Amino acid sequence: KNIESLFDYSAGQFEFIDHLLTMGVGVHFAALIFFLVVSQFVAPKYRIATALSCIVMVSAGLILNSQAVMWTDAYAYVDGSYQLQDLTFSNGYRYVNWMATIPCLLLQLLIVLNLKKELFSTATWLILAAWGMIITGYVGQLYEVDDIAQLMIWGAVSTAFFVVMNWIVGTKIFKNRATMLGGTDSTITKVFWLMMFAWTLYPIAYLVPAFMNNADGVVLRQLLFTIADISSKVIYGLMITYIAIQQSAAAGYVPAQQAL
Numbered sequence: 001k002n003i004e005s006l007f008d009y010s011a012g013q014f015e016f017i018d019h020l021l022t023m024g025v026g027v028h029f030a031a032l033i034f035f036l037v038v039s040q041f042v043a044p045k046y047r048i049a050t051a052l053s054c055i056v057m058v059s060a061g062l063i064l065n066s067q068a069v070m071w072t073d074a075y076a077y078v079d080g081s082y083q084l085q086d087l088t089f090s091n092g093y094r095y096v097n098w099m100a101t102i103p104c105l106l107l108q109l110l111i112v113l114n115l116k117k118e119l120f121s122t123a124t125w126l127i128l129a130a131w132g133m134i135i136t137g138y139v140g141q142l143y144e145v146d147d148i149a150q151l152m153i154w155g156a157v158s159t160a161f162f163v164v165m166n167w168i169v170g171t172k173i174f175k176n177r178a179t180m181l182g183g184t185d186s187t188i189t190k191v192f193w194l195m196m197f198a199w200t201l202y203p204i205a206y207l208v209p210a211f212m213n214n215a216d217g218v219v220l221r222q223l224l225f226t227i228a229d230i231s232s233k234v235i236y237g238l239m240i241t242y243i244a245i246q247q248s249a250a251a252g253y254v255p256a257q258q259a260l
């Protein structure tokens, strides 16, 4: 059902996808140690934001690791090219995992924004819009080989949820940044633009079967996911952590003031 299963891969292409995924694991588990150790320097009001990055690191790290092992299980070097064997490789597992990682990324943003009834109501609408976007995207990617028109349609429905979700995010950011301490009102605007850039890479990767239906396209989609994953989880995570420690320090939390 996926474009990955259509082609044989050169040693170069196969190895590069393997390296990308393996690097992904490395980066997320390395970042996982950073967030764990710096969590002691975050005040109790914001400590869950740092804990959420740890959850994200392990979740994304486990899926990338599963993808890497599935990649190597599925293909073998036969007559000069990596060819598909008994098992299959699919990007479908990422979609399933986004059901958990996307709410996590959104929740840590809400915490550093100083959201408190307001927090539960905003989290529910965000998670429902996020699940709507993920589910419609998952259905759409089932047709990336058999029905391009269907991929485009479910993609349009997914984009509508993405846009409304982004509008909720931006509205809350640009409204609640005045509550933010230690000059983090400036930082949070950059986090908004970082999310807009990084999350927009996922629907681009989704559209790869439409404009680059070949093995090089398979490499590109994995490259795009790698850039997007590192930017949206790791880089985003580090900015959320800085915002949490800076605000904690401005709020009189001694470990944060000493660590800075």
Ligand SMILES: *C/C=C(C)/C=C/C=C(C)/C=C/C1=C(C)CCCC1(C)C
Pocket: 060, 098, 101, 102, 105, 133, 134, 136, 137, 138, 140, 155, 158, 159, 162, 199, 200, 202, 203, 206, 228, 229, 232, 233
């Ligand atoms: C760490 C993983 C993250 C931040 C996943 C983000 C996923 C998206 C922003 C999903 C985007 C999609 C569209 C807006 C349309 C096509 C289908 C999707 C689900 C790939």
Ligand SMILES: CCCCCCCC/C=C\CCCCCCCC(=O)O
Pocket: 022, 023, 024, 025, 026, 027, 028, 030, 031, 034, 234, 238
């Ligand atoms: C086999 C894969 C190779 C392993 C790559 C992991 C090497 C670690 C390098 C970058 C990971 C990103 C984590 C950044 C540490 C946080 C410190 C900081 O930037 O403030």
Ligand SMILES: CCCCCCCC/C=C\CCCCCCCC(=O)O
Pocket: 012, 013, 016, 219, 226, 227, 228, 230, 231
């Ligand atoms: C901010 C996210 C950074 C992600 C780092 C990705 C590292 C790879 C970047 C550039 C190397 C490009 C190498 C060219 C690939 C050749 C494809 C092939 O093997 O056939």
Ligand SMILES: [Cl-]
Pocket: 043, 044, 045, 046
């Ligand atoms: Cl506190």
Ligand SMILES: [Cl-]
Pocket: 059, 060, 063, 094, 097, 098, 101
């Ligand atoms: Cl993920």
